[PDB]
């Protein structure tokens, strides 16, 4: 039955990513005083399916890559890791109930930089490499704050278990005691996934690294990128917007937890439509000069606050 469980997790993820493209195009449209896809199927419900077929029957380029083996390794790694980051998520019961699940997601997330770096090499273009280096430097810089912020929150939880975050928020959301950390966690997730106002890769007039890809290989990078947008917003809701779990009616948890995860995913689309784009030197200064000093200071505060109130959580 476990094999059925894996497929009941993978296929719905891909379908959710497929229809996120539609929802993104329509929310952006109405914030721009237009409609978005409403011709391909009722209210554009067949638009995602048309786009998929079109890309997979379009001839791919595959230029004279310096390797031709990194060019095929990069999208496998991106999509393979993107699906792997879902297996420990409690919704409310994990597919894999890890003891160190929060640490597992950091570990797998830090490996996604290779697909950005490898695709830079494979393109064989000197300029495409520069774009890959800027993207890589952005991702590693902003996962410094992901690790420290996560550590600060877990000091009020007591473990790296993801399902213990549900117990921790059984009386109150962690957004209340730790809203300053939530702000810098939310922005740090935009920078990680190269989202506006942090999308210099897709931000033409300055550069992207996945420029030589077309057809199916391009869609694989796209699917992995959007599955990470949903996953990080599911992580945020679990971390800062805990949903009460009733063991007799687990579906009640899933409905409430999904609504929160959608509202946070739509917030990503909302923020894209509202602001201009950061300069490369300016998003680096937002991390090394503004977030990091506060994150380090709040880490000191959250190591000491539980001790001086007698509120250290249980180890188990």
């Amino acid at each position: 039955m476990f094999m059925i469980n894996i497929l009941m997790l993978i296929i719905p993820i891909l379908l959710a990513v497929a229809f996120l493209t539609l929802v993104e195009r329509k929310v952006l449209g109405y914030m721009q005083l237009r409609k978005g896809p409403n011709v391909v199927g009722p209210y554009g419900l067949l638009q995602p399916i048309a786009d998929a077929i079109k890309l997979f029957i379009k001839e791919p380029l595959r230029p004279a890559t310096s390797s031709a083996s990194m060019f095929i390794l990069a999208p496998i790694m991106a999509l393979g890791l993107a699906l792997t980051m879902w297996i420990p998520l409690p919704m409310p019961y994990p597919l894999i109930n890890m003891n160190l699940g929060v640490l597992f997601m950091l570990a797998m997330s830090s490996l996604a930089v290779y697909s950005i770096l490898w695709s830079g090499w494979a393109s064989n273009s000197k300029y495409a490499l520069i774009g890959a280096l800027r993207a890589v430097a952005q991702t590693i810089s902003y996962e410094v704050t992901l690790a420290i912020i996560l550590l600060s929150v877990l000091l009020m939880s007591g473990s790296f278990t993801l399902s213990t975050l549900i117990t921790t928020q059984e009386q109150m959301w962690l957004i209340l005691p730790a809203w300053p950390l939530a702000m810098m966690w939310f922005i740090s997730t935009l920078a990680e996934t190269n989202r506006a106002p942090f999308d210099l890769t897709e931000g033409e007039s300055e550069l992207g690294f996945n420029v030589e890809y077309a057809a199916g290989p391009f869609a694989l990078f796209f699917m992995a990128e959007y599955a990470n947008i949903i996953m990080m917003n599911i992580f945020t809701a679990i971390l800062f917007l805990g949903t009460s779990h009733n063991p007799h009616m687990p579906e009640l948890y899933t409905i409430n937890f999904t609504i929160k995860s959608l509202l946070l995913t739509m917030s990503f689309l909302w923020i894209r439509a509202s602001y201009p784009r950061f300069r490369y030197d300016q998003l680096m200064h937002l991390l090394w000069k503004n977030f990091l000093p506060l994150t380090l200071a709040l880490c000191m505060w959250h190591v000491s606050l539980p001790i001086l109130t007698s509120g250290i959580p249980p180890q188990t």
Binding site: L103, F104, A107, L111, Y114, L117, W121, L129, V136, T316
Partner: protein
């Protein structure tokens, strides 16, 4: 064949080492060292070390090895010896595997056994905690001296590297 998972991983561990030890282009050499690192974590996980195994992914693979690949793509300007060394490495691995799987005893400097790694595992545990985790958390209660010297060295690493790279 699932009882010898640790030995199978170790065999893949060695083959990766023969990969980048033969020194192909740095791009492929770093690729082979990532495979060995992942296999290396797999071995540590099956011995009960979960925090240590995951620390390999986060700090070694997702850390140092990213800096290695990052520096290679920017300062490396993207033969018979490589193939000769690579083939020589695999043959020695095959013979070492062949003999330890035939008579289950090999003597090369040390006396190695071939029964199986599972035979040395401890047979009793009923704790309400992770023994590995307790030891690592002791870094702050017992390892006061370790924390000071390690922290100072990391601080000096920042100072030293900026001095070296200024160039004037």
């Amino acid at each position: 064949m699932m009882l010898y998972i640790v030995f199978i991983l170790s065999v893949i561990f060695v083959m990766g080492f023969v990969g980048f030890s033969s020194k192909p282009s740095p791009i492929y050499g770093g690729l082979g060292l990532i495979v060995s690192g992942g296999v290396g974590c797999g071995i540590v996980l099956n011995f009960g070390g979960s925090f240590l195994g995951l620390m390999v992914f986060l700090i070694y693979l997702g850390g140092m090895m990213v800096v290695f690949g990052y520096t290679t793509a920017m300062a490396t300007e993207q033969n018979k010896a490589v193939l000769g060394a690579f083939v020589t490495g695999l043959l020695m691995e095959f013979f070492m595997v062949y003999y330890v799987l035939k008579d289950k005893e090999v003597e090369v400097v040390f006396e190695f056994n071939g029964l199986g790694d599972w035979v040395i595992y401890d047979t009793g545990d009923s704790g309400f905690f992770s023994e590995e985790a307790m030891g690592i958390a002791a870094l702050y209660s017992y390892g006061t001296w370790l924390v000071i010297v390690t922290g100072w060295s990391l601080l000096i690493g920042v100072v030293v590297i900026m001095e070296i790279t200024r160039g004037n």
